[PDB]
Write a protein that binds this ligand. Structure first.
Ligand code: MG
Ligand code: MG
Ligand code: MG
Ligand code: MG
Ligand code: MG
Ligand code: MG
Lengths: 296, 283
């Protein structure tokens, strides 16, 4: 398995995902429109942050990354657009880190840039929280690139895999830098306990694992739950896919027990990510110029 | 209902499991009589503004879990160790207190005082934030619809809640200064450490504290997800929880040797304390 694929299922599963969201979430996500200059403010900061790492990346590639933030926040409830712009920058620059050959990982060079982004957009205390989460994320991505721990958690069972993904997919980082956008106390506390990350991990990870399976197997990347099944076996795939859909539904139904603003945010993240993932260049083909490995 | 009809068998089954999968037994940390008094003085000073007194016996009951569940082979900082002793004991008191007794204005400063006494500046912020998050979570979720949904839906929703609520995430973020081991610090700060150890800690505590919490109408206990009266269903459910512990423990063994030691000493350590301590023999 290195040239295995979920291509045959692409159509049916997208419809299965879509019908699950129509039944259980209902409310469609709405894309944040960035003005002319906000978009270039963001992209300018993004280049500045990765510039020390010595790899050019395109405005096309930036706008691929930033799409998840434009689509998966909660525009009904946004209050702080400076915090929003920060999440755009931080998520974009850590995507680059994610897509990057570990030889290009310079902490001494990159970590000061993360701190600068945070101090620019947040107040003193939010900046510290956003930075520790940024630091932990890029440190975790680097730590596990060939770790035996990653192999154990990703090959043992769904539970061990999703436990790894709370940090690795970046959703704990996302909550801890997104709470200042909303200035909602309940959500802020769920972000700080990581309950918010834990509630949304499977919904984000299952969707992303399906649509990025082809790219990741081609690159030898083993962090994908559908590697726990034989995708060439249609019966095994469909049974596994079904249990992953049950996981998403159970999570969503428990999310509805949270207060109204908080659950709106959780569901806009799960559903928004699905709209971005299924409409974006990054998940259209295994290898292209917005998702190719950034190497030596 | 009660799980006393099962206590004898399940204790042996727990032990058999640890003997096979962990083997290395926990050992109790001995404090000098000076150290014990410093801890108890710090504990009494932190709870005093809340207006409740705590017997010296009940403090030593609480501190048992820290004496037994650290990894004495790897300790490099006894000031950090006494911090955990103090922080664990005082947050125990907060756990057992009626929500009306909860006052953040008075208690949060005492937590920060403790962390500032025993830790460097960076560690003190990490320990204090985790202490704040724990007591704020325990308060927030008393009679919360969220807690009811997460504890009555499935084991998976339940254990997700317990990562924070049982206090293991707090434990790791206040305990990594004890060891100054760079890998363990990172797993502690990602909360991977807490996630790896949540079920081993929670399943044990849930079994032995089931009787108390059912009497007090507390729902945060996984054995309320099965019918403890039906002994077939109980044995089935208890086996699945045992399988949960075994899988976690085998995956923990892929962590580095020192980190793996701390994780397993934590889970096994808590089982010995729980089974022997005053806290868990009557409601
Ligand atoms: Mg990744
Ligand atoms: Mg990736
Ligand atoms: Mg992926
Ligand atoms: Mg309790
Ligand atoms: Mg409790
Ligand atoms: Mg208990």
């Amino acid at each position: 398995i290195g040239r295995s694929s979920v291509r045959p299922y692409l159509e049916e599963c997208t419809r299965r995902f879509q019908e699950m969201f129509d039944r259980h979430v209902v409310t469609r996500p709405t894309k944040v429109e960035l003005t002319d200059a906000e978009l270039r403010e963001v992209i300018d900061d993004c280049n500045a942050a990765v510039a020390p790492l010595g790899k050019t990346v395109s405005d096309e590639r930036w706008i691929s990354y930033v799409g998840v933030v434009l689509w998966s926040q909660s525009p009904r409830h946004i209050k702080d657009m400076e915090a929003f712009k920060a999440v755009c920058v931080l998520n974009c620059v850590t995507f680059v880190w994610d897509d990057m050959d570990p030889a290009l990982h310079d902490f001494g060079l990159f970590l000061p840039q993360l701190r600068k982004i945070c101090e620019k957009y947040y107040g003193p205390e939010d900046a510290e929280v956003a930075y520790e989460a940024a630091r932990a994320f890029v440190t975790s991505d680097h730590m596990f690139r060939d770790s035996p721990i990653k192999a154990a958690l990703c090959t043992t069972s769904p539970e061990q895999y999703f436990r790894f993904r709370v940090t690795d997919i970046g959703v704990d980082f996302w909550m801890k830098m997104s709470y200042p956008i909303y200035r909602h106390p309940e959500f802020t506390e769920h972000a700080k306990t990581s309950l918010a990350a834990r509630m949304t991990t499977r919904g984000l990870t299952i969707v992303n694992d399906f649509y990025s399976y082809d790219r990741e197997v081609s690159l030898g990347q083993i962090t994908n739950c559908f590697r726990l099944c034989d995708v060439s076996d249609e019966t095994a795939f469909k049974e596994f896919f079904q249990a992953r859909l049950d996981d998403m539904i159970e999570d969503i139904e428990c999310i509805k027990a949270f207060d109204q603003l908080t659950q709106d945010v959780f569901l806009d993240l799960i559903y928004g990510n699905f709209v971005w993932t299924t409409s974006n260049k990054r998940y259209k083909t295994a290898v292209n110029d917005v998702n190719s490995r950034i190497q030596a």
